[PDB]
C-alpha cells in the first residue's frame, strides 16, 4: 500500500545542488513489474485491432491464471500474452486469424502457435472449433460490401461446409472464396489482391480454393438473391 511523493513546493524541499531532498522511490515486485508490463502490452495489442474492453479483461484473466499456475517458464512474456489475447477472442465467440494477431504483436505466427498449443495443454481448458460463419462480418465490412452481399457470402460458405465439398482446407480459404463469389456476382467487384490482403491468404491459395468450389455455384447461392451478374458469366478461375 505504497504512496508517492509530490513535487517540491518551497526552499526546504530542495537540496543546495539544485535537486529535491525527498525522492519518489517506489517498491514493486519483479513479478508485478512483469504483470504490469504485460497488461500494458495487452491493452496496446487489443486497441490496435479495436477490441472491446471485455476481451481485454478476459485476456488479463487468462494471463493471470496461467502466470500464477507457472507452466510457461521460458517463453517470452509478449508471446504468451499475445496467445492469451487469441484465446480470449475465440472464447467470446468471435475468433481471429493468427495472421491478424501476428500483424499487431512483435511475435511470429510459429511462436504464438506453439504458445497457443502449450497454454491449452497446461490449463486444461477446452475451446470450441471455429467455423466459416464466425469470420464473415469482419471480412466483409472491411472490404466495403453491402449487407445482401454479406448474406450471400455467409450462405454459400455455410452450404459448402455442410455439404463437405472441400475437406481439409482452412476456414480462411473458404471464407475468402465466399467473399470472392459474392463480390464478383454483384455490383461491388473486388479483386483477389484486395480480398487476399485482408485475409492474409496468398493470391495462389485463393485460386487453389476457387478451382473446386466453382462448378457447383448455383446450388450454393440462396433462392432469394438478386443476381446482378449471372452465374454462367463468372470468370473461369
Amino acid at each position: 500500500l505504497s504512496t508517492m511523493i509530490g513535487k517540491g513546493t518551497g526552499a526546504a524541499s530542495f537540496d543546495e545542488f539544485g535537486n529535491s531532498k525527498y525522492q519518489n522511490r517506489r517498491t514493486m515486485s519483479s513479478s508485478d513489474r512483469a504483470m504490469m508490463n504485460a497488461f500494458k502490452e495487452i491493452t496496446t495489442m487489443a486497441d490496435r485491432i479495436n477490441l472491446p474492453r471485455n476481451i481485454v479483461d478476459r485476456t488479463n484473466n487468462l494471463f493471470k491464471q496461467v502466470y500464477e499456475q507457472k507452466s510457461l517458464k521460458g517463453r517470452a512474456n509478449d508471446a504468451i500474452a499475445s496467445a492469451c489475447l487469441y484465446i480470449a477472442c475465440r472464447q467470446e465467440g468471435v475468433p481471429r486469424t493468427f495472421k491478424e494477431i501476428c500483424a499487431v504483436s512483435r511475435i511470429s505466427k510459429k511462436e504464438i502457435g506453439r504458445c497457443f498449443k502449450l497454454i491449452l495443454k497446461a490449463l486444461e481448458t477446452s475451446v470450441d472449433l471455429i467455423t466459416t460463419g464466425d469470420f464473415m462480418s469482419r471480412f466483409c465490412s472491411n472490404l466495403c460490401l453491402p449487407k445482401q452481399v454479406q448474406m450471400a457470402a455467409t450462405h454459400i460458405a455455410r452450404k459448402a461446409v455442410e455439404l463437405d465439398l472441400v475437406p481439409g482446407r482452412s476456414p480462411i480459404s473458404v471464407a475468402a472464396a465466399a467473399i470472392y463469389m459474392a463480390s464478383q456476382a454483384s455490383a461491388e467487384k473486388r479483386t483477389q489482391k484486395e480480398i487476399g490482403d485482408i485475409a492474409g491468404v496468398a493470391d495462389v491459395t485463393i485460386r487453389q480454393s476457387y478451382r473446386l468450389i466453382y462448378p457447383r455455384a448455383p446450388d450454393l447461392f440462396p433462392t432469394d438473391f438478386k443476381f446482378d451478374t449471372p452465374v454462367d458469366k463468372l470468370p473461369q478461375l
Partner: protein, 134 residues
Amino acid sequence: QAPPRYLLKFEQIYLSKPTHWERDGAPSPMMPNEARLRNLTYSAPLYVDITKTVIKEGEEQLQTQHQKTFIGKIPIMLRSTYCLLNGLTDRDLCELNECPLDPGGYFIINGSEKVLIAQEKMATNTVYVFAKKD
C-alpha cells in the same frame, strides 16, 4: 542512431467519419443517438501519413512511405463540419433519431453530453501596468 540513420518525417493528417467497431471487428458509422444510448464515445479515427527514410553507407537511401497510419481517436463535436450530422436536412435528421432543434456544440464521452465552458484568461503578448498598493 546505433552506423544506420533513420528519419521519420510526418505529413498530411487524414481524419474520417466517426466509426464504431463492434465485437466482430466490423466498422460501422457511429450514430450520435447510439453513442448516447450504448454509452459510447463519439470519436473519429485519426490517420497520419509518415514517410520513413533510411540513411546508410553505400548509396542506398531508400524512401518508404506508409499511407494513413492509425494513431488514435479524437472526440468529435456534434454538428461540426467533421461530424456525421454535417449538412443534413431536417427530414434526414429525424430519420437518424436526432433532434433537428439540437444546436450541437457538445462532445459525447462515455454517453454523457460534455460541453467545454469557455475559459477566460488574461490577454497575452500585451504590456500591462498595474497599481499594486502593497
